[PDB]
C-alpha cells in the first residue's frame, strides 16, 4: 500500500498532474551545496554559454536567494517558483538512483591482487577470440595496457567505453578509451542476471550488476561475465574531466541525468535526496540540495533522476545499487 523502506514519503498529499506549483516547498532549512551549485553554473557559463543565457535568469535568482540566506521559506522574494514532481507513485516520491566515476586500481605487472589486464587493440586476428578465450590468455602480454584488482570493474569499463586508472605511483590519473571490439556480438550481463532470478529486473543497472559482483566469488563473477562472448578494446587518452551529454562537467552532487522531454538540459532542481547506510539501504536521513539536469541515460526515463555522485570510491558508496526515493522541486521564474 504505502510502503517506506526505500525513503517514500506521503506528506505532501495525492498528485493528480506531473508538476504542482506549490506556495512553499515541504523541506525545512536551505540546500547545503550553495558553493557546489555555483561551482556548476561557472562551468556551464564556460562550458555551454547558450544554455546558460537561456537559463540565467533562473540561476541568477537561484544565487540571489542563496546569498540572502537560502531558506526556502524565502524564495517567493525572488521571484522563485517551486513545482513539486509527482514522482513514481503520485505522492511526490521521485525515483532516485546514483552514478559516479570510477577510478580502476591497477598495475603495470601482475601482483597480489592486480591480476586482471585491459587490453589495447591486437591485431585482427587476435580480435576474433571470444571473452572466454582472451581471460584463458589467448591474446600476448605486449598488448596488455594494465593489470587491475577487479574482473567486474573491467567489464563496467567494457560497458562504458571508457575509464580512469590510477596506477598508485603519484602519477597523473590515466584515462584510456574506446579503440576497437572482438569479433563477437554481445549478450546482456543484466538479462542474464534477471533471468537467474539474481536481480530485479526495476533494479538492474550498471550499479546492481556491480554490487553482485561484489558480493560473489571470482568464480562466479568471471563465469557470469564469460555469458558474454564480446570484448572491449582501449587506447591511452589525454586526461579530460568527467562530462555530461551537455558537454558541461559535471560537479558531484550538484548534477543529475534526467529525460531531456521531461526535465530539460538547463533545469534547477531543488531536491531532499535519501541518504544512504553502509549496504545501500535509505538509512531516515535526506539531504536537501540543488542539482542542474546536465546528462542523459539509456535507462533514465520520465521523472527518474541519476545523481552524479563524483569521482572515487566514496562517490561510489554514496551512488547505492537500487531505487531510493526523494522529493523534488523544479525551480523557475515567473515573467
Given amino acids: 500500500s504505502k510502503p517506506t523502506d526505500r525513503g517514500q514519503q506521503y506528506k505532501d498529499g495525492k498528485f493528480t498532474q506531473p508538476f504542482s ?14 558553493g557546489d551549485f555555483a561551482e556548476q553554473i561557472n562551468h556551464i557559463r564556460n562550458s555551454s554559454p547558450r544554455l546558460y543565457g537561456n537559463q540565467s535568469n533562473v540561476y541568477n535568482a ?5 546569498r540572502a540566506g537560502g531558506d526556502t521559506r524565502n524564495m517567493r522574494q525572488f521571484g522563485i517558483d517551486a513545482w513539486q514532481m509527482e514522482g513514481a507513485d503520485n505522492y511526490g516520491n521521485v525515483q532516485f538512483t546514483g552514478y559516479y566515476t570510477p577510478v580502476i586500481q591497477a598495475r603495470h605487472t601482475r601482483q597480489g591482487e592486480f591480476q586482471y ?16 578465450e582472451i581471460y584463458a590468455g589467448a591474446l600476448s602480454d605486449k598488448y596488455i595496457l594494465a593489470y587491475s584488482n ?4 573491467n567489464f563496467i569499463m567494457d560497458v562504458q567505453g571508457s575509464g580512469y586508472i590510477d596506477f598508485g605511483d603519484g602519477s597523473p590519473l590515466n ?12 549478450r546482456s550481463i543484466g538479462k542474464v542476471l534477471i533471468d537467474r532470478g539474481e536481480v530485479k529486473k526495476e533494479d538492474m ?3 546492481a550488476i556491480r554490487h553482485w559482483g561484489e558480493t560473489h566469488s571470482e568464480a562466479e563473477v568471471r563465469e557470469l561475465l564469460e555469458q558474454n562472448p564480446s570484448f572491449v578494446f582501449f587506447k591511452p587518452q589525454s586526461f579530460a574531466p568527467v562530462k555530461g551529454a551537455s558537454a558541461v ?5 550538484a548534477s543529475v541525468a534526467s529525460d531531456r522531454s521531461i526535465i530539460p538540459p538547463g533545469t534547477t532542481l531543488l531536491a531532499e535526496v535519501p541518504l544512504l547506510d553502509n549496504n545501500g539501504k535509505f538509512n531516515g536521513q535526506y539531504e536537501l540540495r540543488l542539482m542542474v539536469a546536465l546528462d542523459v541515460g539509456g535507462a533514465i526515463k520520465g521523472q527518474h533522476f541519476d545523481i552524479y555522485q563524483g569521482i572515487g570510491p566514496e562517490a561510489g558508496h554514496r551512488a547505492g545499487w537500487y531505487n531510493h526515493y526523494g522529493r523534488v522541486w523544479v525551480l523557475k521564474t515567473a515573467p
Fill in 249 to 253: 562537467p559535471l560537479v558531484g552532487r
Fill in 150 to 153: 577487479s574482473l567486474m570493474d
Fill in 117 to 132: 589486464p585491459i587490453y589495447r587493440m591486437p591485431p585482427k586476428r587476435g580480435r576474433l577470440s571470444s571473452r572466454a
Fill in 205 to 207: 543497472s550498471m550499479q
Fill in 62 to 66: 537561484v544565487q540571489e536567494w542563496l
Fill in 175 to 186: 584515462f584510456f578509451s574506446y579503440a576497437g571490439k572482438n569479433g563477437h556480438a554481445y
Fill in 21 to 34: 506549483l506549490v506556495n512553499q516547498p515541504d523541506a525545512v532549512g536551505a540546500p547545503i551545496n550553495a
